[PDB]
């Protein structure tokens, strides 16, 4: 038996945090306790006539199951005769996209830090049977103590009984099996994590051109290059991540999951148990 449904009266409503298609994030003081939340607020209309029901309804679900410190959480929801309200953990660092523009790029010490909290978030989100499927530094967020916070789950997959095949998430990050069968997998999680890692260590993604059409042709045909500078055990890692049969991809199902992942040589001096309580490096 859970406290009273919440209001809009109930906040006193600040800056915009991110606009979306759909939705609105807004930073929001709960007045009788003076918490922040951050409040993504989808407008009823807008998302009925987009027929955008199925995700909004998904993300409230899957967001709902999540109960791990790497994840965004979800507080409480409401609606009045307009709009949803999600109320959620405000995460008050902003993206990791934020940071690696800022220092242009990671050194090796805080590159493994932060893969190594990404690795955790996957290995539990997959765990509990759901592919994130737009898996990216915009939606890999940091609290306060510098910890990431992953969100976004709109755009996600719940598995059953490894299948999909409407949605094709940013670009970059897109995997190829999307592209060719257009079907995803935990896998396809993967991919995007080896551009990430790429991301970090070289400061740009790894497959980038013009328009989203070259961006494509360079990921079906695996056409990048490392940097001379990239630090070689995560070179290796990333090797073993940007693979295109996705069967093959260092933490999946078929590689006998997460367990050969955390032992890459990249991770050697990671204690994995902790990771959440431990200080992060800083930047930089
Ligand atoms: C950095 C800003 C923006 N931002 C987005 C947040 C989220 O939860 C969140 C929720 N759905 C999607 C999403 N990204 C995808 C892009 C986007 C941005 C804003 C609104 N629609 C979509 N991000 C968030 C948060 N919890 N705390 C602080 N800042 C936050």
Known sequence: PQPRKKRPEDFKFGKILG??????????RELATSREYAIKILEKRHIIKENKVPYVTRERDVMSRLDHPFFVKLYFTFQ???KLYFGLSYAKNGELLKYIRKIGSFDETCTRFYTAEIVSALEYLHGKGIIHRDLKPENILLNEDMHIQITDFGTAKVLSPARANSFV????YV????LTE????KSSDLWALGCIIYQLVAGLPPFRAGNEYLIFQKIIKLEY???EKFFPKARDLVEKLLVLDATKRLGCEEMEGYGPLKAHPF?????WENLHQQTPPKLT
């Not at 995997?175 to 999307?178: A, G, H, M, Q, T």
């Not at 257009?182 to 997998?185: L, N, P, V, Y």
């Open 19 to 28: 606009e979306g298609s759909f939705s609105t994030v807004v930073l929001a």
């Open 267 to 271: 991770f050697e001096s990671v204690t």
């Open 182 to 185: 257009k079907s995803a997998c």
């Open 175 to 178: 995997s190829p099996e999307l």
């Open 225 to 227: 290059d490392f940097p």
């Open 80 to 82: 009045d005769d307009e």
């Open 169 to 172: 998430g940013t670009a970059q």
